[PDB]
Design a protein around this ligand. Structure first.
Ligand SMILES: *[C@@H]1O[C@H](CO)[C@@H](O[C@@H]2O[C@H](CO)[C@@H](O)[C@H](O)[C@H]2NC(C)=O)[C@H](O)[C@H]1NC(C)=O
Ligand SMILES: *[C@@H]1O[C@H](CO)[C@@H](O[C@@H]2O[C@H](CO)[C@@H](O)[C@H](O)[C@H]2NC(C)=O)[C@H](O)[C@H]1NC(C)=O
Lengths: 50, 122
């Protein structure tokens, strides 16, 4: 788990652009206000490289 | 002496930093934390996530007010900066004609939407 990845983002990336910000993700019509919950996904998840 | 470029300019996301020190120029893309009125003597504070830097000969050399033209433009991470210096006799942009040599391109790779100039008090 030294390596992680992103799968949800509001908009796709740009060539040679490294998106790095740790901003909570809102997948629903309602906001998240910086608190985990429904439609509240941390932008990064970790791979289980076994 | 320089500029601050960024889509947030709030240390939440990346924001480049540029300065024309009388000794050199220094451009560093870190998660810089500034103050309300940042000017050099200290402009920033708590340099975090320093990922890219560049220092070389400074930008601006020397009755006639000196004119310094620059075209700041960014493509696919490659931020392009053009340099130009021209003496102007004593306002109004001088109706005339000239070109701009390119100066340097750096692979900062950040999102930029707003930019604010770094100015000295006097
Ligand atoms: C910028 O530096 C900060 C340290 O202040 C890093 O913060 C943590 O970095 C680890 C790296 O794996 C993350 O797992 C944590 O979630 C981060 N925590 C916080 C509160 O930010 C940050 O990752 C650094 N950013 C980059 C792009 O290197
Ligand atoms: C770079 O930042 C700008 C400024 O936020 C982004 O432009 C906005 O994108 C969001 C979606 O992520 C839209 O909801 C806004 O309407 C856009 N306009 C604004 C506020 O400038 C831009 O999308 C970012 N770059 C990338 C590749 O997503």
């Amino acid at each position: 788990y030294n390596y992680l990845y992103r799968l949800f983002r509001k908009s796709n990336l740009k060539p040679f652009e490294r998106d790095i910000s740790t901003e909570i993700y809102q997948a629903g019509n309602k906001p998240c206000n910086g608190v985990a919950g429904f439609n509240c996904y941390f932008p990064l998840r970790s791979y289980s490289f076994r | 002496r320089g500029w601050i470029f960024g889509t947030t300019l709030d240390s939440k996301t990346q924001s480049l930093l540029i300065v024309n020190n009388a000794t050199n120029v220094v451009i560093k893309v870190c998660e810089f934390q500034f103050c309300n009125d940042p000017f050099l003597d200290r402009v920033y504070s708590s340099a975090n996530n320093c990922t890219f830097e560049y220092v070389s000969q400074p930008f601006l050399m020397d009755n006639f007010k000196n004119l310094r033209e620059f075209v700041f433009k960014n493509i696919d991470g490659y931020f392009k900066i053009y340099s130009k210096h021209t003496p102007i006799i004593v306002e109004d942009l001088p109706q005339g004609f000239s070109a701009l040599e390119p100066l340097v391109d750096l692979p900062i790779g950040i999102n930029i939407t707003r930019f604010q100039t770094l100015l000295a008090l006097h």
